[PDB]
């Protein structure tokens, strides 16, 4: 039992549809480069999946280190694709827009060709001013910070499938903590179980 | 040989071309056609200013032209006459921003005189059922000839060494292009002895040889992406960035 | 396979590891077991005298388990607000466990009477319902201890592993197999007073808090993935 | 490690002895800043008596 | 340059150094760090029950910092009269700090209920205003401790350095940068009781005093000159 | 000693401070006041990106503030509260051009996170008959205190180590300023955990101590120039230059 024993387990975190007619700049995910990856399940409170590195980050105050996200691009060898997995350090919410692949390739990026091999584990860098990084969510407390950095995934060259196979392709996005991942300060966890999803309000009337 | 056992990861080995932080892969083996051997640094003969290498920032790869190629393009047809030290800037000033936003090209903004060898990849992402074959050819100083309008054809550029892209196997064309010009430096802005033809080395031109031939139910589109690395560059003659005019559209 | 790695496409240089905070803060955190021994609130109750109880009568009984209780949310503002704490959030990630627990039960100030505390490994756990603190006799051969309120009103405990098992279930238990109810709790701890009927009336609606931690014997089994989680800031504010 | 060995069994008293003025270590709460500190007598301040 | 020396024009013979009081008083004083561990009053409050508080409710919360509080002067005759004490007067002379703090919170006599105390490194400090003691729940995963009033009504603490920083700001903090509020306090200590609503009414307007000191981990950074000072005998006498 | 024989070249030796291509001289010996020792590189703890030195281009000196100082300025009076990693950019965006025109600061345009030690010279060109004495003082994180409005005075900044400029001998104040902040990196643009206080290290403030005292027929003006070298810088977190907002006026 070990933090790095948990952080070396992939957890499936995002289903990305990848169609034929997606253009050569269309966004597939702008998801945050923290372990706290948002996956929403469809109660008056909502429940979420997380990566194991996401939860075991959510039992700590601070985290640092790489984040190896695995892109498993489920296709035949007859499909040919190409897509950037880019990574920009330090984009705020107002800079969450203005994003495309042409402004992405200035930063660090990896172009992949979907061919006879269909899977690659990109290693998200840890690029920040701070040695650690505060938990995104914290306790039930409206102050206490978004991601250090943002991943992006644009379709560099669109899917050109053969006419015997399908127009659409699933892309699964796993999240695993990197080899340099480490967490330090034990604080109040930001996540609770769903054994008892009952909640009681405290209005005063 | 003869035991293909594909799992969840497909079959083939994904080969890298790791560099500074842009890392790009291809599934297929390249077909390089080096035109000339590697050149010398050339800083000893005509620059006493601080001749600074920038291999940590300028040797990143950069997409400069992607384009759709369908079956309607005929036999002997141009696709892109990329002029490579220009097109690295022309894709930037075409793509709605200045030079100071892209970390590959800020030494062109600061320094005035450039030298350096280029690396050029022309990736295709054709389906396997398509039949076709592009060619990529580097030519030196296309705009310094008037008779290239007679030559701009597949039969002329086949005689010189040239890379080939078969759309059958979705081959990739790596293409080393060493710097060879009459003067050993290309300037980056308007310069007191020439202005026209700024930062021009010649034509990377991508001529179709075999057009897309498919069924009636065939995949019509075939996108082609061109990346460029710039590794053994030297920059000299530091000056102000306000002198740098925009490149020509 | 889950933990496979098809093609690494790293851009990074090798990071300096801090040694999990040992370099900065002077202490490691990679071992989660050494975090588990930090105490966490187990379950807080309010005393309620129902009958004119005998001195033998247990005041409350509760099963003893590292899984965290059936969460009892006038709500308790911690269990309404701070959901689950740490140890069932880790214990969600393991199907089984085996080992000791520590308790350190804290008693209020206005009580003075002597306190007896029992471990009962005979008691099974029938379903996830009624796996909480229960406000209800003293027994001989069960493992016992008396803390005196007048010296110090906080007892401490090292409740051992008494099961005839290889390990025990760690997720929330639905009581499917009838003998499997013998294999969830470590047993059953009961807290009872020696207070007479006159003086226990003053102690009504006083809080009795119980903490818990594992204490170096606990060794979790086979990994199981986490359940769906609730994000705590999404909980509503008390509109006034 | 759990320390299960059974502990000591003392007697409290409220005050240290008073008539004892000899080879006997007396614990206090010094308002001096130093734990090893003792009032001292320099070269002229060593008293005669 | 500041500390240069152009031309010495000494008249003096060489003085015998006392070794900073070691020769006379049997103890050195040159190291100011060993003076810093002498305790100083941090902030004294008066208890005030606003609502019929739950047992979970913190009675007061305060940020934890060696800078000295936002000084809260019916004035408190110490903070009206004895301005600032020692440790912020030294801490005026250094822009940054990094290290531990000790607390030793002292509770009044008429209280009897159990006391829980939290460290919360999640809490930032928003401006120099509201950087004082605040009379307002209990939480799980924060570092916790219960002192029992009946054994001894003075808790003691070693609150560590939990920041993701190289060091932290030591002058009075105006909250310019938004993330810099994470880097001033060590965290936030909260003191809350387990007292019910009936017995906490007796404890209203009882003083709760908090002390502080650094405890050997503190290492001050880059020198900064002192601010302007106020001379204390110039303060007026209470004319009767 | 005691044999001054001045020729056409004057008397004194002109001492250099050669660097990359900006070379600047002073006639007088400096008075440095180093506040803190030299710091470590700090690239091992929080950056896995390409941490590239730029000592060929960023270690050039650069004028960031010149100003007129006359005798009408009183005793305890500010002249310039230069915030030094900002004022290197603020003089640029004040001086009618963007960052991409100055070769010192283009890695601030490309990269997002900065670290580095500074060198700061405050040259004066006073006449010898003038009497006066400026002081230069480096302070760490001026804007991260509210009480500096009580401290912003010559008596406060004299207690910390500080350089002095006598207008009598026209002394120069070299001033090494090593990088020391709470977090070991200063960001260069709007960053997801702080925005306000971007690239702020603290105040270089130039307070008058002795004002200009001259005759009735005296030289009233006394210009003061401030140069800055930036040598042990590291830049990390490469991103697009279109993200870089302008600095605050
Ligand atoms: O109250 C007691 C008495 C003895 N002891 C142990 O018994 C041993 C003999 O005690 P004496 O003081 O030599 C020694 O190992 C002690 O530590 C206790 O631990 N507690």
């Amino acid at each position: 039992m070990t933090v790095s024993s948990i952080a070396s387990r992939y957890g499936l975190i995002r289903r990305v549809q990848w169609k034929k007619d997606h253009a050569k700049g269309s966004l597939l995910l702008q998801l945050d480069a923290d372990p706290f990856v948002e996956q929403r399940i469809e109660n008056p409170i909502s429940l979420y999946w997380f990566a194991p590195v996401g939860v075991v980050s959510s039992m700590f105050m601070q985290w640092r280190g790489s984040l190896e996200y695995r892109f498993d691009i489920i296709a035949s060898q007859f499909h040919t694709g190409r897509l950037i997995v880019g990574y920009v350090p330090g984009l705020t919410a107002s800079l969450q827009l203005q994003m495309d692949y042409m402004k992405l390739k200035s930063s660090s990026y990896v172009v992949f060709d979907l061919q006879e091999s269909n899977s690659f584990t990109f290693e998200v860098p840890y690029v920040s001013y701070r040695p650690w990084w505060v938990r995104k969510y914290g306790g039930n407390y409206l102050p206490s910070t978004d991601a250090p950095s943002t991943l992006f995934m644009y379709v560099q060259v669109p899917l050109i499938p053969m006419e015997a196979v399908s127009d659409t392709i699933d892309i699964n996005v796993y999240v695993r903590g990197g080899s340099s991942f480490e967490v330090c300060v034990p604080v109040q966890p930001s996540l609770g179980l769903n054994w008892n999803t009952d909640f009681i309000l405290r209005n005063d009337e | 040989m003869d035991n293909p056992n594909p799992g969840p990861d497909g079959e083939g080995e994904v080969e890298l071309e790791k560099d500074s932080n842009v890392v790009l892969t291809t599934q297929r083996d390249p077909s390089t056609s080096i035109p000339a051997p590697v050149s010398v640094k050339w800083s000893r003969w005509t620059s006493n200013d601080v001749v600074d290498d920038y291999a940590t920032i300028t040797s990143r790869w950069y997409q400069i032209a992607e384009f759709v190629w369908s079956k309607d393009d005929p036999f002997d047809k141009e696709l892109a006459r990329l002029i490579l030290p220009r097109a690295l800037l022309s894709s930037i000033e075409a793509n709605s921003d200045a030079i100071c936003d892209v970390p590959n090209t800020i030494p062109f903004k600061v320094h005035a005189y450039w030298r350096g060898d280029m690396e050029v990849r022309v990736q295709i992402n054709s389906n396997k059922f398509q039949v076709g074959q592009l060619q990529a050819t580097w030519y030196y100083s296309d705009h310094e000839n008037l008779n290239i309008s007679s030559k701009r054809s597949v039969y002329g550029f086949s005689q010189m060494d040239h890379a080939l892209i078969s759309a059958s196997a979705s081959n990739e064309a790596k293409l080393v292009i060493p710097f060879k010009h009459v003067y050993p430096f290309l300037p980056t802005r308007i310069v007191p002895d020439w202005t026209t033809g700024i930062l021009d080395m010649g034509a990377l031109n991508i001529r179709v040889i075999a057009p897309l031939r498919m069924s009636a139910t065939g995949p019509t589109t075939c996108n082609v992406v061109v990346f460029i690395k710039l590794n053994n560059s030297e920059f000299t003659g530091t000056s102000s960035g306000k002198f740098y005019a925009s490149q020509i559209r | 396979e889950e933990s496979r790695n098809t093609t690494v496409l790293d851009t990074t240089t090798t990071l300096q590891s801090s040694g999990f905070g040992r370099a900065f803060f002077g202490e490691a955190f990679n071992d989660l077991k050494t975090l588990m021994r930090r105490y966490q609130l187990y379950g807080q109750l309010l005393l309620s005298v129902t009958t004119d109880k005998d001195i033998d009568h247990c005041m409350f009984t509760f099963p003893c388990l590292p899984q965290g209780l059936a969460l009892d949310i006038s709500p308790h503002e911690i269990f309404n607000r701070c959901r689950d704490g740490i140890i069932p959030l880790i214990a969600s990630g393991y199907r089984f466990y085996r080992g000791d627990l520590r308790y350190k039960i804290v008693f209020p100030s206005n009580v003075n009477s002597n306190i007896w505390v029992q471990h009962r490994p005979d008691r099974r756990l029938e379903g996830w319902s009624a796996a909480k603190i229960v406000n209800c006799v003293y027994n001989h051969g069960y493992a016992s201890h008396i803390q005196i309120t007048r010296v110090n009103n906080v007892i401490e405990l090292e409740v051992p592993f008494y099961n005839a098992t290889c390990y025990n279930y760690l997720q929330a238990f639905n009581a499917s197999s009838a003998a499997s109810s013998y294999a969830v709790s470590l047993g059953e701890i009961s807290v009872g007073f020696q207070a007479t009927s006159d003086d226990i009336a003053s102690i009504v609606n006083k809080p009795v808090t119980i903490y818990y931690s594992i204490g170096d014997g606990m060794q979790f089994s086979q990994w199981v993935g986490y359940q769906p989680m609730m994000i705590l800031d999404q909980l509503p504010a008390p509109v006034v | 490690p759990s320390y299960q060995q059974s502990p000591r069994h003392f007697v409290p008293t409220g005050m240290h002895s008073l008539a004892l003025g000899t080879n006997l270590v007396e614990p206090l709460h010094a308002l001096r800043l130093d734990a090893a500190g003792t009032t001292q007598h320099p070269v002229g301040c060593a008293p005669d008596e």
Side-chain angles (χ1 to χ4, degrees), chain A, chain B, chain C, chain D:
Chain A
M1 65 198 76
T2 297
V3 171
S4 72
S5 68
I6 295 172
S8 69
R9 293 185 188 274
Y10 291 99
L12 182 64
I13 214 64
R14 193 63 60 84
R15 184 192 186 277
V16 175
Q17 195 69 45
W18 185 56
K19 290 174 67 178
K20 180 179 179 181
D21 51 353
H22 284 172
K24 60 185 180 181
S26 63
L27 180 61
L28 299 182
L29 50 88
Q30 60 177 355
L31 63 92
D32 296 330
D34 52 349
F36 298 95
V37 191
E38 194 75 26
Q39 179 52 249
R40 186 177 182 274
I41 305 166
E42 291 294 326
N43 289 323
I45 64 169
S46 62
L47 301 175
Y48 298 92
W49 293 107
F50 284 97
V53 67
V55 170
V56 82
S57 176
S58 73
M59 291 181 282
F60 283 81
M61 181 167 70
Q62 293 174 354
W63 59 271
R64 63 185 292 267
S66 299
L67 295 176
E68 295 186 354
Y69 295 178
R70 180 178 69 182
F71 291 98
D72 288 331
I73 306 170
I74 304 163
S76 70
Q77 62 186 357
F78 296 98
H79 296 90
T80 58
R82 185 182 295 276
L83 50 95
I84 300 173
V85 176
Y87 168 76
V88 186
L91 295 182
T92 180
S94 68
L95 293 175
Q96 191 60 251
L97 48 89
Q98 286 176 353
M99 293 309 293
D100 51 350
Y101 69 101
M102 190 59 71
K103 296 183 182 67
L104 174 61
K105 292 171 73 67
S106 69
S107 61
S108 176
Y109 69 101
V110 170
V111 177
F112 180 76
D113 282 336
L114 176 65
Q115 280 176 353
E116 297 176 356
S117 179
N118 57 0
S119 172
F120 67 98
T121 303
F122 175 69
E123 180 163 0
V124 169
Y126 178 77
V127 180
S128 70
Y129 63 94
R130 187 182 294 166
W132 298 87
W133 189 256
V134 186
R135 179 191 287 169
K136 183 175 179 179
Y137 291 155
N140 200 355
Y141 185 71
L142 276 78
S144 172
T145 300
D146 52 353
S149 59
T150 50
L151 193 76
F152 293 106
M153 180 169 70
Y154 290 100
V155 190
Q156 178 59 36
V157 171
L159 181 75
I160 301 174
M162 193 173 72
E163 66 186 3
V165 294
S166 72
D167 291 330
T168 65
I169 285 176
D170 299 333
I171 288 176
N172 286 122
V173 181
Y174 293 89
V175 168
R176 187 176 67 92
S179 179
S180 68
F181 183 78
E182 54 181 1
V183 294
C184 56
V185 170
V187 294
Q188 174 177 357
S190 64
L191 299 181
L193 304 174
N194 53 353
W195 295 348
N196 194 359
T197 62
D198 290 329
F199 184 80
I200 291 176
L201 294 174
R202 196 185 58 81
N203 47 358
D204 290 331
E205 295 293 325
Chain B
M1 296 302 292
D2 288 327
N3 194 358
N5 45 8
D9 292 328
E11 183 179 0
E13 184 71 29
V14 180
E15 58 186 2
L16 293 169
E17 197 167 359
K18 184 175 172 64
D19 285 322
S20 298
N21 51 357
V22 176
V23 174
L24 59 90
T25 64
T26 56
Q27 296 295 104
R28 293 292 186 271
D29 293 327
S31 70
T32 66
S33 68
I34 293 172
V38 185
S39 68
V40 199
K41 188 70 177 295
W42 281 88
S43 174
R44 292 188 298 275
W45 289 87
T46 174
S47 177
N48 294 111
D49 203 1
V50 178
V51 178
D52 193 77
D53 48 354
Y54 289 95
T56 61
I57 49 174
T58 56
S59 69
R60 300 170 66 248
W61 293 91
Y62 191 76
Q63 176 178 1
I64 55 172
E66 65 178 2
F67 58 93
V68 178
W69 173 58
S70 66
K71 66 181 178 181
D72 287 332
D73 289 329
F75 170 69
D76 181 72
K77 174 67 169 64
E78 76 182 4
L79 298 173
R81 290 189 295 115
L82 299 169
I83 301 170
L84 296 176
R86 296 176 65 89
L88 180 61
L89 301 179
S90 177
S91 68
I92 292 173
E93 295 182 355
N95 200 4
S96 179
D97 56 352
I99 308 296
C100 73
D101 276 326
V102 174
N104 289 319
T105 57
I106 52 171
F108 294 99
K109 180 77 170 180
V110 180
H111 297 89
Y113 283 154
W114 178 76
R115 192 183 185 275
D117 297 331
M118 306 189 293
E119 296 288 325
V120 168
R121 293 180 75 93
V122 185
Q123 300 191 4
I124 198 171
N125 282 317
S126 67
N127 196 358
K128 192 189 285 185
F129 298 111
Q130 290 177 351
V131 174
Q133 180 170 358
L134 280 68
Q135 76 173 1
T137 307
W138 173 252
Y139 183 82
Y140 289 91
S141 71
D142 59 347
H143 201 267
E144 301 297 326
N145 184 5
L146 53 89
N147 291 111
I148 194 170
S149 294
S150 69
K151 192 173 174 65
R152 191 177 294 171
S153 173
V154 299
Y155 302 105
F157 291 101
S158 65
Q159 294 176 354
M160 67 189 72
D161 43 356
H162 66 282
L164 295 171
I165 298 168
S166 65
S168 173
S170 176
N171 191 356
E172 194 273 329
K174 187 176 173 66
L175 184 65
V176 185
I177 298 169
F179 170 67
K180 272 187 70 178
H181 195 203
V182 159
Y183 298 103
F185 281 93
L186 290 178
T188 62
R189 59 183 178 83
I190 290 172
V191 150
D193 204 357
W194 75 75
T195 71
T196 310
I198 180 63
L199 201 59
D200 182 86
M201 198 188 294
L204 182 69
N205 49 359
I206 305 170
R207 305 284 299 169
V208 180
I209 292 172
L212 278 182
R213 293 175 180 272
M214 63 194 76
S215 67
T217 65
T220 305
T221 61
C222 178
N223 299 321
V224 166
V225 188
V226 171
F227 292 99
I228 178 168
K229 180 180 178 179
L230 193 58
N231 52 3
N232 198 5
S233 66
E234 68 184 3
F235 288 82
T236 179
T238 304
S239 176
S240 175
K242 294 181 73 68
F243 292 101
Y244 172 70
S246 176
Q247 298 298 320
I248 308 166
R249 180 72 175 172
Chain C
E1 199 272 331
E2 183 267 330
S3 181
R4 67 173 171 82
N5 195 353
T6 303
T7 297
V8 184
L9 286 169
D10 178 71
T11 325
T12 69
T13 66
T14 301
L15 188 65
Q16 186 61 256
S17 175
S18 176
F20 288 84
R22 173 72 76 191
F24 290 101
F25 305 100
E27 48 177 356
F29 298 98
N30 197 10
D31 45 352
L32 191 54
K33 182 175 180 292
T34 195
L35 193 148
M36 204 78 67
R37 295 172 294 180
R38 172 171 289 172
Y39 289 98
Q40 167 170 346
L41 176 58
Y42 189 71
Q44 176 178 353
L45 71 101
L46 298 173
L47 295 170
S48 65
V49 173
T50 301
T51 62
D52 45 357
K53 289 176 184 284
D54 193 78
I55 307 299
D56 298 335
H57 289 177
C58 58
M59 189 57 67
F60 61 94
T61 65
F62 69 104
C64 58
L65 46 85
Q67 309 184 356
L69 286 175
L71 192 142
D72 192 3
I73 300 98
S74 179
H76 301 168
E77 295 294 326
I78 177 165
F79 291 106
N80 200 1
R81 187 63 59 186
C82 299
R83 185 75 64 185
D84 289 324
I86 296 176
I87 301 162
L89 182 54
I90 300 166
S92 174
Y94 294 101
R95 186 65 178 171
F96 309 97
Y97 75 99
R98 184 187 180 93
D100 292 338
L101 286 173
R102 294 177 172 176
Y103 280 96
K104 194 184 293 291
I105 300 101
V106 184
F107 291 95
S109 63
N110 288 317
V111 68
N112 289 315
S113 66
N114 292 317
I115 294 165
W116 56 269
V117 169
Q118 298 293 331
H119 180 199
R120 298 191 173 104
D122 283 326
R123 299 295 182 270
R124 61 169 65 89
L125 181 139
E126 289 182 351
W128 186 255
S129 181
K132 63 181 175 65
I133 303 170
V134 171
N135 300 114
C136 285
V137 293
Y138 185 84
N139 301 317
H140 294 282
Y142 294 144
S144 66
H145 184 272
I146 287 179
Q147 178 53 258
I148 291 93
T149 312
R150 192 177 185 183
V151 173
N152 193 4
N153 52 0
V154 50
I155 195 168
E156 288 178 348
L157 288 176
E158 173 77 21
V159 178
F161 186 83
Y162 283 158
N163 290 119
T165 62
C166 292
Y167 36 68
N168 288 322
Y169 292 96
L170 189 56
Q171 298 288 324
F173 179 65
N174 58 358
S176 175
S177 297
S180 177
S181 57
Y182 287 107
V184 171
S185 73
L186 293 182
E188 204 281 329
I189 298 169
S190 70
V191 173
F193 294 95
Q194 289 179 352
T196 58
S197 64
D198 53 351
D199 191 76
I200 200 65
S202 295
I203 313 167
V204 181
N205 296 114
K206 294 292 183 180
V208 175
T209 60
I210 300 168
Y211 289 170
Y212 76 113
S213 65
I214 58 98
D216 196 76
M218 187 60 72
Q219 292 286 324
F220 295 112
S221 302
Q222 176 65 41
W223 176 262
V224 161
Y226 288 139
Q227 290 184 356
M229 292 296 111
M230 55 182 287
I231 301 173
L232 291 176
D233 60 353
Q234 194 180 2
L235 294 173
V239 174
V240 173
Chain D
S2 64
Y3 181 71
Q4 300 174 358
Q5 293 176 355
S6 282
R8 297 287 297 276
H9 202 192
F10 47 65
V11 171
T13 46
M15 187 183 292
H16 299 287
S17 63
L18 279 78
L20 287 169
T22 60
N23 292 321
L24 169 135
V25 179
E26 181 175 358
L28 296 174
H29 292 161
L31 289 172
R32 199 178 297 110
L33 192 143
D34 179 78
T38 306
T39 178
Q40 291 183 359
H41 302 86
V43 297
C45 300
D48 53 354
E49 182 68 32

